[PDB]
CSV table of C-alpha atoms in Angstrom, one decimal:
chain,number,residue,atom,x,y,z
B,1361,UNK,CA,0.0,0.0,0.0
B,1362,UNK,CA,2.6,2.5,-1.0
B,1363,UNK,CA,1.5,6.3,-0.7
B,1364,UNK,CA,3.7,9.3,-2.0
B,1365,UNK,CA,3.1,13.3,-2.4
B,1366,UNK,CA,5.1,16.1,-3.8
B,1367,UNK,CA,4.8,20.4,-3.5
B,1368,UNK,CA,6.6,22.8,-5.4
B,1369,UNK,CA,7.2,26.0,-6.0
B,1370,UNK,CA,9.8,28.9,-7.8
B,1371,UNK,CA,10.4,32.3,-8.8
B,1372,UNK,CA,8.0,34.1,-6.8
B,1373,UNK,CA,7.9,38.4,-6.9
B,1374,UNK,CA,11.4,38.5,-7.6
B,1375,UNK,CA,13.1,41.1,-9.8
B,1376,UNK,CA,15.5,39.9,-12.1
B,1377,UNK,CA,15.8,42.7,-14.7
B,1378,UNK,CA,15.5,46.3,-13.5
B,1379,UNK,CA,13.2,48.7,-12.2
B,1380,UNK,CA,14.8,52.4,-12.5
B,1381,UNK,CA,12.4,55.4,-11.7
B,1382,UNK,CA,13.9,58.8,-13.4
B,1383,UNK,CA,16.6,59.5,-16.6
B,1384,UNK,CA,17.3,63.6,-17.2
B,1385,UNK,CA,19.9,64.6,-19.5
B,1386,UNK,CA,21.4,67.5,-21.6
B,1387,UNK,CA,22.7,71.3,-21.8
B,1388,UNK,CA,20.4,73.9,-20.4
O,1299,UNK,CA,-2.4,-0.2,-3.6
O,1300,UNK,CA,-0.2,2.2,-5.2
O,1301,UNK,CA,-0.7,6.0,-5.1
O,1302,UNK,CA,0.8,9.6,-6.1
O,1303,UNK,CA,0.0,13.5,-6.2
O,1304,UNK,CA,2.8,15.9,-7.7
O,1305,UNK,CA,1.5,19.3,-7.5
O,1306,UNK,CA,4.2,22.3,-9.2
O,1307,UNK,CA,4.1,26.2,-10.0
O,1308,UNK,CA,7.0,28.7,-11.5
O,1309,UNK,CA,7.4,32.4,-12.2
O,1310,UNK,CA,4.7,34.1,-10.3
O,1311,UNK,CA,4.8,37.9,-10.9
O,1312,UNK,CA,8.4,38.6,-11.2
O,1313,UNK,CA,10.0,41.2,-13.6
O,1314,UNK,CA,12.4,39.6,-15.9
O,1315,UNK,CA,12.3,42.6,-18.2
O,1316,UNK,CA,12.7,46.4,-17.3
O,1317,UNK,CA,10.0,49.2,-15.5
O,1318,UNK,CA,11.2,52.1,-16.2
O,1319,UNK,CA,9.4,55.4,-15.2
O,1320,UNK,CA,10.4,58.5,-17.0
O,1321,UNK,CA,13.1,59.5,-19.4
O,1322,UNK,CA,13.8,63.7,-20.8
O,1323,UNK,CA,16.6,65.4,-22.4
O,1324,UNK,CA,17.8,67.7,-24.8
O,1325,UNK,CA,18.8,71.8,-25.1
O,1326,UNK,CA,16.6,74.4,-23.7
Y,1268,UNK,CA,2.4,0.0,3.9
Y,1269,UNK,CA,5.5,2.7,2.8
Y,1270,UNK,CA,4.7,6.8,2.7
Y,1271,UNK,CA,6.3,9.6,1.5
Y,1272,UNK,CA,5.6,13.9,1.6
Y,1273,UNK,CA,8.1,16.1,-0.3
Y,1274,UNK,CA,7.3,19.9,0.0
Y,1275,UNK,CA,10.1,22.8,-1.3
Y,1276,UNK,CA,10.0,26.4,-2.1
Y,1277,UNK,CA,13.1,28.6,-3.7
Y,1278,UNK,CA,13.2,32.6,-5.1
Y,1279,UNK,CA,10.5,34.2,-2.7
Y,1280,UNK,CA,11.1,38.0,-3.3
Y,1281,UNK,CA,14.6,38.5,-4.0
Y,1282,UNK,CA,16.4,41.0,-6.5
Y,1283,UNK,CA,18.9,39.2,-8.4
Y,1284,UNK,CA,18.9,42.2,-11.3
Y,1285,UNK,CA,19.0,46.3,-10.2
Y,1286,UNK,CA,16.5,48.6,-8.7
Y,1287,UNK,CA,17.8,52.4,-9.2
Y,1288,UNK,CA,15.7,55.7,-8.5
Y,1289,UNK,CA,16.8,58.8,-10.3
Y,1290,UNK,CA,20.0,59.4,-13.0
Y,1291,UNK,CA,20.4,63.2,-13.9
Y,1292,UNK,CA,23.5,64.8,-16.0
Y,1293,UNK,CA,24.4,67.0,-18.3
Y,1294,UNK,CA,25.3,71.1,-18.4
Y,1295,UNK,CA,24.0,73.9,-17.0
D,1316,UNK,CA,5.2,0.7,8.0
D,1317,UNK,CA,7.8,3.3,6.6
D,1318,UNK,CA,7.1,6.6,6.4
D,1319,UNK,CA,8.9,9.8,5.9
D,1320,UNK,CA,8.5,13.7,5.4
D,1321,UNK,CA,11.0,16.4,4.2
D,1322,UNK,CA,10.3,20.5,3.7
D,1323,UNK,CA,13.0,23.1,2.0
D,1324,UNK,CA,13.1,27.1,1.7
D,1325,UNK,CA,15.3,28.5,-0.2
D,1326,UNK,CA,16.4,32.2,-1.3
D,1327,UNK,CA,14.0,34.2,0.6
D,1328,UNK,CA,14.2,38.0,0.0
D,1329,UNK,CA,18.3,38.3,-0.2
D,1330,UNK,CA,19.4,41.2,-3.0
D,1331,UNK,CA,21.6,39.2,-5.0
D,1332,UNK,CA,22.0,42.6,-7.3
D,1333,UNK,CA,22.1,45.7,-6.8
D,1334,UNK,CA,19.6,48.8,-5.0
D,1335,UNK,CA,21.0,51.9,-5.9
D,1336,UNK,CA,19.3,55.1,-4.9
D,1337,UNK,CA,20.2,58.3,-6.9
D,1338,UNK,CA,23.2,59.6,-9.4
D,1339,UNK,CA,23.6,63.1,-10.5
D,1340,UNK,CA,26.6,64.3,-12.7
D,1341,UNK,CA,27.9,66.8,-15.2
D,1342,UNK,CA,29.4,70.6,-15.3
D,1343,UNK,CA,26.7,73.4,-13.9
I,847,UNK,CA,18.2,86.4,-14.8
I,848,UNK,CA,16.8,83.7,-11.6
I,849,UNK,CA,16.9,79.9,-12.5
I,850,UNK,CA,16.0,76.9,-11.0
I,851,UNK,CA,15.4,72.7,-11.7
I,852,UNK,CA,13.9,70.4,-9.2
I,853,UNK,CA,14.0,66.4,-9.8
I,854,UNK,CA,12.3,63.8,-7.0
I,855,UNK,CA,11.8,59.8,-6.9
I,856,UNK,CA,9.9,57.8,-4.7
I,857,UNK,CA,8.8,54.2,-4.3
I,858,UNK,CA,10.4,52.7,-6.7
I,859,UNK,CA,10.2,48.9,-6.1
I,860,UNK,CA,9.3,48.2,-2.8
I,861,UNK,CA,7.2,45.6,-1.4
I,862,UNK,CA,4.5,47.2,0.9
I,863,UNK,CA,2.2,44.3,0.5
I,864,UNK,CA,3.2,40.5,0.7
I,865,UNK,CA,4.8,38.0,-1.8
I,866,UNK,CA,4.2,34.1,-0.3
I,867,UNK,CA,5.1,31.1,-2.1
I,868,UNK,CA,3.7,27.5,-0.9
I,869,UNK,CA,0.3,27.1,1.2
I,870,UNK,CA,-0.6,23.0,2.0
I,871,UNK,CA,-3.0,21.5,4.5
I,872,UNK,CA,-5.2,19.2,5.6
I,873,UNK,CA,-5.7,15.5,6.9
I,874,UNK,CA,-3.9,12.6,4.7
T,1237,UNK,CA,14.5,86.4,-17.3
T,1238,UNK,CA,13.3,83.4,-14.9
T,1239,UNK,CA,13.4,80.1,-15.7
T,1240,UNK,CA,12.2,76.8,-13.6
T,1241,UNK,CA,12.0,73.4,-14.5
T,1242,UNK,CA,10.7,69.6,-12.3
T,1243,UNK,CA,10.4,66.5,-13.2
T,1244,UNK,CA,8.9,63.9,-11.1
T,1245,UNK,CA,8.4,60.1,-10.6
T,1246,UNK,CA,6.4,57.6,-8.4
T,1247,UNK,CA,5.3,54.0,-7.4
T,1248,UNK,CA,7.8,52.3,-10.0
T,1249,UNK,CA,7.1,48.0,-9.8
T,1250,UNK,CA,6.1,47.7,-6.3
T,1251,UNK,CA,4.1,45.7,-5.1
T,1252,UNK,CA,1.4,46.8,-2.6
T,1253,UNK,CA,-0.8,43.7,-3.1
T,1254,UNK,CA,0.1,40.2,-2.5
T,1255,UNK,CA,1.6,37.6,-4.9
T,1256,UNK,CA,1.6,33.9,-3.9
T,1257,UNK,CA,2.3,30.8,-5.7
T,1258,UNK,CA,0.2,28.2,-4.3
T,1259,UNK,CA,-2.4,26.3,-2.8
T,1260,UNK,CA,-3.6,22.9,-1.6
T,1261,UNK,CA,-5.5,21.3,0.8
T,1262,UNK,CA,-8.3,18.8,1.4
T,1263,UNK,CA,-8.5,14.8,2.8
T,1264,UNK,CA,-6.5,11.9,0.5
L,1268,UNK,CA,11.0,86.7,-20.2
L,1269,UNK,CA,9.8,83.8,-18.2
L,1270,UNK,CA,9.4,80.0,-18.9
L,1271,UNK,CA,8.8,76.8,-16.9
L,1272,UNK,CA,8.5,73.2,-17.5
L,1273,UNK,CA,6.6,70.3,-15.6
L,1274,UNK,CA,7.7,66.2,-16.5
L,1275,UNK,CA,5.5,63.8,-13.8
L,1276,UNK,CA,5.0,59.7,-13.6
L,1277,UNK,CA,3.0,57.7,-11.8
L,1278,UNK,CA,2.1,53.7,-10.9
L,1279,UNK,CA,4.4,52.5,-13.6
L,1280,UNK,CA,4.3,48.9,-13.4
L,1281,UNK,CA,3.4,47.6,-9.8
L,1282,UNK,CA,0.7,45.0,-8.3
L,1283,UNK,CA,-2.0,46.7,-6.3
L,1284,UNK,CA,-3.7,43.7,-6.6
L,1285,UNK,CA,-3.0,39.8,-6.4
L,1286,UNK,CA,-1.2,37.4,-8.8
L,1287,UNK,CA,-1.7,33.7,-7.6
L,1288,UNK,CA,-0.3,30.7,-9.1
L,1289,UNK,CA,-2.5,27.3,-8.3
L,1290,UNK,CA,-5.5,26.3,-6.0
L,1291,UNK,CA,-6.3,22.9,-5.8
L,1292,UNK,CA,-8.5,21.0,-2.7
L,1293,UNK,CA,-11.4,17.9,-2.4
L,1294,UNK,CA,-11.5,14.9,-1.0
L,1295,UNK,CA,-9.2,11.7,-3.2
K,424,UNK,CA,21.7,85.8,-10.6
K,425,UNK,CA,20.4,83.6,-8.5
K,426,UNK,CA,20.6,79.6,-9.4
K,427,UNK,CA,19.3,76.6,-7.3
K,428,UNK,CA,19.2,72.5,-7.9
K,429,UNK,CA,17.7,70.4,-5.8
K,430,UNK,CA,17.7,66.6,-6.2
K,431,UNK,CA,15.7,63.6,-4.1
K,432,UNK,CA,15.1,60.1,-3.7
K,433,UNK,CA,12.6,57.8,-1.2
K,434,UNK,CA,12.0,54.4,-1.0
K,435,UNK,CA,14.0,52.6,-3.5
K,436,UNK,CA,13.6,48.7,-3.0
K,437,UNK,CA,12.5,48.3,0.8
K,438,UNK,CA,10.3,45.2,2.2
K,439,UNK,CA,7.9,47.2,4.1
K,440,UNK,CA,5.6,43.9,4.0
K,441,UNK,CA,6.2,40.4,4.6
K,442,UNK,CA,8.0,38.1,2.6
K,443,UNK,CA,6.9,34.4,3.1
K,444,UNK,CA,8.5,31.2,2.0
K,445,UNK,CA,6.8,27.8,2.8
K,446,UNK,CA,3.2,26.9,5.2
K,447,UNK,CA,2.4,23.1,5.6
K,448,UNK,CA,-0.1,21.9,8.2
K,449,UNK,CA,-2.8,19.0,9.6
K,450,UNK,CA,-3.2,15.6,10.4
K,451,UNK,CA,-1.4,12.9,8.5
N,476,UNK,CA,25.6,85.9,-7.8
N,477,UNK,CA,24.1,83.8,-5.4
N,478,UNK,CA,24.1,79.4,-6.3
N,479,UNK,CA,22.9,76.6,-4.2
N,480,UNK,CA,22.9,72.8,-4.7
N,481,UNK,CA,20.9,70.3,-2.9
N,482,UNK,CA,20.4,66.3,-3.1
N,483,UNK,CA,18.7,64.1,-0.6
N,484,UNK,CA,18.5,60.1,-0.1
N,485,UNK,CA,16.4,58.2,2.0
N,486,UNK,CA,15.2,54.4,2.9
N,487,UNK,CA,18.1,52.1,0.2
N,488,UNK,CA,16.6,48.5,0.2
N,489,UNK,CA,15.9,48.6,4.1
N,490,UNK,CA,13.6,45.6,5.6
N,491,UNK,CA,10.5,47.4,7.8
N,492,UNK,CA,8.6,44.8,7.5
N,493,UNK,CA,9.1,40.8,8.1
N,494,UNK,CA,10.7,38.0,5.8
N,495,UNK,CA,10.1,34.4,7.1
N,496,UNK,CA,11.2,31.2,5.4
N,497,UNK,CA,8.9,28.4,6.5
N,498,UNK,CA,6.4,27.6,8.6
N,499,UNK,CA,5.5,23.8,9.4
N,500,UNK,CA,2.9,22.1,12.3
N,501,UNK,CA,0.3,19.8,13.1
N,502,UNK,CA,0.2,15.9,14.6
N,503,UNK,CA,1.3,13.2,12.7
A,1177,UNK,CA,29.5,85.9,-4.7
A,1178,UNK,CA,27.6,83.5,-2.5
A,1179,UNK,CA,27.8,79.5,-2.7
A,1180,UNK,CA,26.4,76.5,-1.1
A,1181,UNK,CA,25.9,72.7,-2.0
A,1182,UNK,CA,24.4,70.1,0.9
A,1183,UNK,CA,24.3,65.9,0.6
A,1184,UNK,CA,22.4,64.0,2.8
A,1185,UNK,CA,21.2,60.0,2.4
A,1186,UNK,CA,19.7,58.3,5.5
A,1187,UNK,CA,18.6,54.3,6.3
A,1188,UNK,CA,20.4,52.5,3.6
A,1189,UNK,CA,20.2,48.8,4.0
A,1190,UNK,CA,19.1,48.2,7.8
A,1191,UNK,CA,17.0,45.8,8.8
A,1192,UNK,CA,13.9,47.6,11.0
A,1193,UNK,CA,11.7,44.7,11.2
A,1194,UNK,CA,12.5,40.6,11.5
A,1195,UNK,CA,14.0,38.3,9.4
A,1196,UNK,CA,13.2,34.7,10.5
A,1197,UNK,CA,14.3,31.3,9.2
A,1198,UNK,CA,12.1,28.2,10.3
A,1199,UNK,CA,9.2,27.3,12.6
A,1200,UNK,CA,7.9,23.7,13.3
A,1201,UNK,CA,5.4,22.5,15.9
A,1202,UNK,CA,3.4,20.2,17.2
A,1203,UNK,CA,2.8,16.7,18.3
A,1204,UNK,CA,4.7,13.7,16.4
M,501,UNK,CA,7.6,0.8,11.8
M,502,UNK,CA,10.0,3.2,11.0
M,503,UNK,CA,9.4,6.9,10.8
M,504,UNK,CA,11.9,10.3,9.5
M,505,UNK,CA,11.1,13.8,9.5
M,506,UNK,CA,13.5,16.5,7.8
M,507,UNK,CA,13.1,20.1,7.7
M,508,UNK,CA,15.5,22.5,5.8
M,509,UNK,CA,16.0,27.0,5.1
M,510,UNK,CA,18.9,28.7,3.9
M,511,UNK,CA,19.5,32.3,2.7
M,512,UNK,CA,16.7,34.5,4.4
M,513,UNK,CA,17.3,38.4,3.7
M,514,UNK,CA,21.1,38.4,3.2
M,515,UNK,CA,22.8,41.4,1.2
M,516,UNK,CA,25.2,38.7,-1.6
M,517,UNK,CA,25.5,42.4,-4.1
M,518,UNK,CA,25.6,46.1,-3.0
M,519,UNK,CA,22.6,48.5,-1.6
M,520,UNK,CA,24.5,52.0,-2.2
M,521,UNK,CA,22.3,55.2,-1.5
M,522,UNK,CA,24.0,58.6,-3.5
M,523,UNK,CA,27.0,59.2,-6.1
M,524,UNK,CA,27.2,62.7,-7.6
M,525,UNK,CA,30.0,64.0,-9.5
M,526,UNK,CA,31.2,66.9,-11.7
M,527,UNK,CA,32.6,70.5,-12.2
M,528,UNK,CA,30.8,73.0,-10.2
H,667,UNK,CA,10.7,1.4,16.4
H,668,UNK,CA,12.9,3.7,14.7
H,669,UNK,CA,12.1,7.3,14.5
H,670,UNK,CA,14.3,10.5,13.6
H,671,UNK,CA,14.2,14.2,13.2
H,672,UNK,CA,16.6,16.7,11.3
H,673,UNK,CA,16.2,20.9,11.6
H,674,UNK,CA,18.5,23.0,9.6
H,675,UNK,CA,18.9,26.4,9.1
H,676,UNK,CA,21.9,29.1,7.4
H,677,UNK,CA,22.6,32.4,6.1
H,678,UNK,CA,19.4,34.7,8.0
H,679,UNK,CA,20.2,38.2,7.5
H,680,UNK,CA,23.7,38.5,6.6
H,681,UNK,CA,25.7,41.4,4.3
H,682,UNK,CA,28.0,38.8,1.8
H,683,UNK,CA,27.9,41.9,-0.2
H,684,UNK,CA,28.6,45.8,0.5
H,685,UNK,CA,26.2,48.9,1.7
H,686,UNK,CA,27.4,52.4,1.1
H,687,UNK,CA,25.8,55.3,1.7
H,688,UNK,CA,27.0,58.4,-0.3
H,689,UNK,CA,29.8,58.8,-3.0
H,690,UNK,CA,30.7,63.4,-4.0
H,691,UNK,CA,34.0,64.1,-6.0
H,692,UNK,CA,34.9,66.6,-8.6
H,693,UNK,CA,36.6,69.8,-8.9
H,694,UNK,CA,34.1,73.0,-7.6
């Protein structure tokens, strides 16, 4: 009567690129 | 009697790519 | 009568990439 | 009448990359 | 001959709510 | 001869909800 | 001889709600 | 001739929420 | 000829909240 | 000929809340 | 009747890159 | 009547990495 179960899970809410806010450049 | 579950899930709301907010420039 | 449970979890919320807020530059 | 359980966690909200706040340059 | 800039950031990727990655119960 | 400039940014990829991966439950 | 010039951004990219992977449940 | 810059940044990449890994419960 | 610079940073990738790895219970 | 400039930055990386590893319970 | 539990959590909230707050640079 | 139980836990809330707070240079 052999019985097994398995969960898994990965890669939750995590950044792996970039998230930048503001870029402002050039003469004035 | 044998028996198995597997239950799995990956990538849930991360940000492989980029969020960026704002970008200006240029002479004034 | 042989049972087995397996339950993991990996990558909850971390930032393997860059999160930067503001980049200004040029003259005045 | 075996029976065993096992339960992992990995990588929970570490900053394997950068957080970078603010970067301002250039002549004025 | 007055002049002034002003440049501002804020929240820029924060967690203010939650990120949770496995949920299992129950009798077996 | 005045001259005033401001740029602004906000809220950039956070997250102020939840994200969660999953779910499971019940009798077996 | 006057001049201004407003740049603003907002909620660029984020998760004010939920993002959930997998719900599963019952009796087996 | 009056000049003035000002430049500011908040909250860049904070947890001000919970971060959660793994939850297992009940009979077995 | 008066001239004034400013620039402020606050809260860099602090934890205000909680992060928890795992969470296990129940009889067995 | 007047002059300033001022730099400030304030709670970069602490840790305000708790960062927890495991819980278990209950009877076995 | 033999019986094994194993519970397991590494890497909760650790800094492995850089959380750096201000950099500003340039002829004044 | 063999039973056994194994808890584990590393790496909660450590800097492997660097946090600075604030970089200025340049001529004025």
């Amino acid at each position: 009567h052999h019985q097994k179960l398995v969960f898994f899970a990965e890669d939750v809410g995590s950044n792996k690129g970039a998230i930048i806010g503001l870029m402002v450049g050039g003469v004035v």
